[PDB]
């Protein structure tokens, strides 16, 4: 009826997750511990005050080794080495791996060694051994005993895969490319500074910075059919949150723009309900802050060049939207704990 | 004479300092080595392409472990521990300590223990035994044998002092307060993230962020008479470079706005020539990118409340202006070696 969860990496996703969880009516989870590179004070403070989310409307307190939010206390640890975490003794079933540093089964496994039973990486799994799931796309194929280390993919993949599915199941994708105009993230530098990636090294708030992404391919993990068909790039721009994907795919079954949006719109209220949102209003990025859906199709922008060439634009709150999907995945595993 | 110089920390001040040098008339310095947390390829790319300064017009290349600029090759070292640097074996006379980390008299000294004969900290020096010099304010009190570790103070101090001097000599400052509206810097996080300082922890490009500063109190290190008289704070705002200080000093000899401006202008043309720039045009911050002077008085903003409460507003290119002063200070030490 309930699994104990620990959060490793109390960053953007780690804190967005905790807030998405507290905001829900019912849950089969219980967040009982957090590991981070900070003290409990810093943790409580960044959770309560957020430049993007605004102040967290909740009763938040803290002490040397814990923070408390609306009656629930969570132990605060600060060990960079997962192998030293007291997961076994704290009876931790699921660990949210959101440090962005343990994305391989090998690294994530360190939590299992420490005593955790399962680890859910909030990023694309690196190397072999991890099971990737995207709610609303292949969440139905979830088996508790399949992988001790799972992944909720990347935020782009979560916005892309759900749209690509409806597009493949209705028009059949022959192939396509994709560009995501993304908000800058913590892996970029505020000012021109040293970095293993010469583009990520440039001042993020004053440049349009291109970066290679795996999101396009990653869709192939939740939609095998598309294996090797999609591809893309990323353009980071001066906004702190909310991104948008530009998907151009060569359909197999020639159609028209009105049909494409008719399909997408149908999904938003049926199959992809809660995952895909259908927007037909002249809106902008900030309007989508706090949007729970994973993909927000801007209908007025859909293009069908010559019956078979389709172009779709979908927004997504890379932090909040994605984090609702992490809560979803965690909840799934909770409802199917073995 | 041509002393041998090494740069520790090839960041904003690091690369800016170099470009100031490579663009000067004659030189009594010779940059032969650069220690940075990166490979030579990265150091070469960042010295050339700059989001603020724009492309560096010079011949630039690099090899497995060095970079050559306009025929001059400089060795590239990559050791985070100053104690392990080849200063002795490379006959390094002076080290430009611009990592932002070894700013205490104790940490800077590690360059000395490694062989360097003198170290110049491009920031306020903390601890005892450091010689602080502000070009145009107390630089004539320089003596090679006075200190092994010297400091060029902060960029705000370099803007504050030259003006505080003219205002003191001419009107004698009783007491005073200051506030600097500064561009964000690499010590601030791009998005809300863990930081020992909860204010520096907040998204830099989307916030006005207050921070304590020792620039006001540091002015006393170069103008002893002001010790215990000046204090202030700093407000980091969303601009990548160029800052402005707001000084409000109580004077002993009552005056009028025109008098304050007349002397500041007098100095900009005489004693403070090349250090304090006088500006009577209605300009904005970006107009000062590249200004060499340390203080750029905005005369139309000068105000004198009731004869003895004076307020001066001065701009300063915190990266480039300050760097010119660092190159100035290195020259002084070169012209007075032994």
């Amino acid at each position: 009826m309930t699994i104990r969860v620990a959060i490793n990496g109390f960053g953007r996703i780690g804190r967005n997750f905790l807030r998405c969880w507290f905001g829900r009516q019912n849950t089969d989870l219980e967040v009982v511990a957090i590991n981070n590179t900070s003290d409990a004070r810093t943790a409580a403070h960044l959770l309560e005050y957020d430049s993007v989310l605004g102040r967290f409307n909740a009763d938040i307190s803290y002490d040397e080794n814990s923070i408390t939010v609306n009656g629930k206390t969570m132990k605060i640890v600060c060990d960079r080495n997962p192998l030293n975490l007291p997961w076994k003794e704290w009876d931790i079933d699921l660990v949210i791996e959101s440090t962005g540093v343990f994305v391989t089964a090998e690294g994530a496994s360190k939590h299992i060694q420490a005593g955790a039973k399962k680890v859910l990486i909030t990023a694309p799994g690196k190397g072999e051994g991890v099971g990737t799931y995207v709610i609303g796309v292949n969440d139905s194929e979830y088996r508790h005993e399949d992988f001790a280390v799972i992944s909720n993919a990347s935020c782009t993949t979560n916005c892309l895969a759900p749209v690509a599915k409806v597009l493949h199941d209705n028009f059949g994708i022959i192939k396509g490319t994709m560009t995501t105009t993304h908000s800058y993230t913590l892996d970029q530098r505020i000012l021109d500074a040293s970095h293993r990636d010469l583009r990520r090294a440039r001042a993020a708030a004053v440049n349009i910075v291109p970066t290679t992404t795996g999101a396009a391919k990653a869709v192939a993990l939740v939609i095998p059919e598309l294996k090797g068909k999609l591809n893309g790039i990323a353009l980071r721009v001066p906004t702190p949150n909310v991104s948008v994907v530009d998907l151009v795919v060569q359909v197999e079954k020639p159609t028209i723009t009105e049909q494409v949006n008719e399909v997408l719109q149908k999904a938003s209220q049926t199959t992809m309900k809660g995952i895909i949102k259908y927007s037909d209003l002249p809106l902008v990025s900030s309007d989508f802050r706090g949007t729970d859906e994973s993909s927000i199709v801007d209908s007025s922008l859909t293009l069908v060049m010559d019956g078979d060439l389709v172009k779709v634009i979908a927004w997504y709150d890379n932090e909040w939207g994605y984090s609702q999907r992490v809560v979803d995945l965690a909840e799934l595993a909770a409802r199917k704990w073995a | 004479m041509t002393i041998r110089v090494a740069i520790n920390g090839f960041g904003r001040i690091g690369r800016n300092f170099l470009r100031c040098w490579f663009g000067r008339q004659n030189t009594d310095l010779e940059v032969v080595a650069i220690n940075n947390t990166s490979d030579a390829r990265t150091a070469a790319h960042l010295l050339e392409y700059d989001s603020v300064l724009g492309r560096f017009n010079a011949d630039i290349s690099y090899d497995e472990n060095s970079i050559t600029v306009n025929g001059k090759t400089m060795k590239i070292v990559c050791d985070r521990n100053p104690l392990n640097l080849p200063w002795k074996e490379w006959d390094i006379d002076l080290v430009i300590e611009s990592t932002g980390v070894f700013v205490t008299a104790e940490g800077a000294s590690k360059h000395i223990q490694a062989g360097a004969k003198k170290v110049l900290i491009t920031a306020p020096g903390k601890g005892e035994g450091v010689g602080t010099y502000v070009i145009g304010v107390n630089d004539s009190e320089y003596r090679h044998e006075d200190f092994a570790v010297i400091s060029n103070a902060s960029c705000t101090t370099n803007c504050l002092a030259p003006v505080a001097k003219v205002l003191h000599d001419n009107f004698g400052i009783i007491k005073g307060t200051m506030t600097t509206t500064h561009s964000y810097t690499l010590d601030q996080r791009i998005l809300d993230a863990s930081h020992r300082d909860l204010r520096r922890a907040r998204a830099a490009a989307v916030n006005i962020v207050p921070t304590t500063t020792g620039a006001a109190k540091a002015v006393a290190l170069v103008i002893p008479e002001l010790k215990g008289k000046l204090n202030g704070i700093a407000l980091r705002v969303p601009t990548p470079n160029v800052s402005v200080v707001d000084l409000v000093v109580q004077v002993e000899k009552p005056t009028i706005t025109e008098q304050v401006n007349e002397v500041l202008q007098k100095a900009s043309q005489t004693t403070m020539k090349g250090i304090i720039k006088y500006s009577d045009l209605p300009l904005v911050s970006s107009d000062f990118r590249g200004t060499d002077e340390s203080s750029i008085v905005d005369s139309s903003l000068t105000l004198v409340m009731d004869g003895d409460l004076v307020k001066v507003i001065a701009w300063y290119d915190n990266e480039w202006g300050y760097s010119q002063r660092v190159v100035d200070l290195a020259e002084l030490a070169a012209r007075k070696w032994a």
Partner: peptide, 22 residues
């Protein structure tokens, strides 16, 4: 990966090493 290969291996969370797949 001359420098960053070995360096980023010991400090994978260092400012010069973070790479978030976006």
């Amino acid at each position: 990966e001359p420098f960053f290969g070995d360096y980023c291996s010991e400090n994978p969370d260092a400012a010069e090493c973070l790479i978030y797949d976006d």
